């Protein structure tokens, strides 16, 4: 079975600066994204670990969508250079042509006092590769989607994370 990684990249722009991002939309992503999004994310509840790099956490998703649940687990948090690595180790999209899709969430800060959030998407693939765009346009839909709702929060609530 031949093995392969298919590559997605997608860009997202923001008016709100790279470390009120971050500290927002990643690192109190938890606690935030359930609260503004119910009908998106129902909660975001940790399996293992202390909220860093190896912690896995079990996602379950609202009346927004047919609500199943997905597990992540943290590959990487640089703090520094606003980088969120983490990979999707049990959901609907794994199966045998599947095994796993690792993700890197990279904020890059813009020359007007916002941000670029740059999202890789990584599908690591067992024999045939059958990827259908539709899915891939579906799922930057709903990041975008949620990230919109993180902006306006974020300028309604201008003193919330800095």
């Not at 670029?116 to 690591?124: L, Q």
């Not at 067992?126 to 990230?147: C, N, Q, R, T």
Request: net charge negative; aromatic share 10%.
């Amino acid at each position: 079975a031949m093995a392969g990684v298919f590559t997605y990249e997608t860009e997202f722009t923001s008016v709100i600066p790279p470390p009120r991002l971050f500290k927002a939309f990643i690192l109190d992503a938890d606690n935030l994204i359930p609260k503004i999004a119910p009908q998106a994310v129902k909660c975001a509840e940790i399996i293992e670990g202390d909220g860093g790099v190896g912690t896995i956490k079990k996602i379950t998703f609202g009346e927004g969508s047919w609500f199943g649940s997905v597990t992540h687990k943290i590959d990487g948090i640089d703090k520094e250079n606003f980088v969120y690595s983490y990979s999707l180790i049990e959901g609907d999209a794994l199966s045998d042509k599947i095994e796993k899709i690792s993700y890197e969430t990279k904020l890059v800060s813009s020359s007007d006092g916002g941000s670029i959030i740059k999202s890789t998407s990584n599908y690591h693939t067992k024999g045939d590769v059958e990827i259908k765009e539709e899915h891939v346009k579906a799922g930057k839909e709903k990041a975008s989607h949620l990230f919109k709702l993180v902006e306006g929060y974020l300028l309604a609530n201008p003193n919330e994370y800095c």
